Amino acid sequence: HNAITRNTMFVAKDKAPYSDELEQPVYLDPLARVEENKKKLVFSDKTI
């Protein structure tokens, strides 16, 4: 309903869930799972 009212159905992702520093460490860990932070689902070094 929000998307139809506000033309915000498609939300382009500006940034990956992982930073440039955690990109490859996440690539190389099959158990690396995103966690919530400031309502955004991002990768953190805690789970790598």
Place this chain on the structure above:
Amino acid sequence: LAMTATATDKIGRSVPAPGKGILTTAREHHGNLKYPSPLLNIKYRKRQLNKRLEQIKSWEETELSYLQEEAELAKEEFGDEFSMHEFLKERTEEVYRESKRQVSDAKKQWGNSFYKSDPRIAPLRGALAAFNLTIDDIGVASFHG
């Protein structure tokens, strides 16, 4: 062809820009390596496969034994047209094919694809360890270059 994989990179706004997405072919978990994983060890998988094959052989023997009792059950449940010889022939072929499939699945679990579930075995390491080759055994890398 031991291994093969495809991958994408990440968010971006440059399609021709290459990325490190295929680095996931080397992914494994390294939180606690105090002891080697037994699954990477060839002889452990060999004895596991040997006991599984013994179980499958016992399964074949029990199935062929039960086939006589099942034929008698079908002898009354299929009328006088029942042929003992034909029933035994079809059902023995079925048992043999099932046993072949179990042997193949055991060899797939312990020889070929023992690294499907294990996150501590990367696709590359596990693909080589199927043939008992270590990471050091890749001698050449044909780069896109």
Place this chain on the structure above:
Amino acid sequence: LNKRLEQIKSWEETELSYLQEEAELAKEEFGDEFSMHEFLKERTEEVYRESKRQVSDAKKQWGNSFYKSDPRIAPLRGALAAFNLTIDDIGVASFHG
């Protein structure tokens, strides 16, 4: 599948039992740094994952993919028989048309 799952449960039990004997072997073959607790944890996780894969293989052999080898079971009939549906149970055909 039931007898195979019983076999896999027995396999779990024998592996977990053998793990104590394998820890003593590794206790002398890894020096005084060996941790009984840590070794048991890693190897119990490994046994659990291995038996999970064994259970999945049995369910894939007898439930999902029992028709891969059998040539008397067509792909269509076998795919439906995975869910216990007969050839008659396809109600609609979305034609290319």
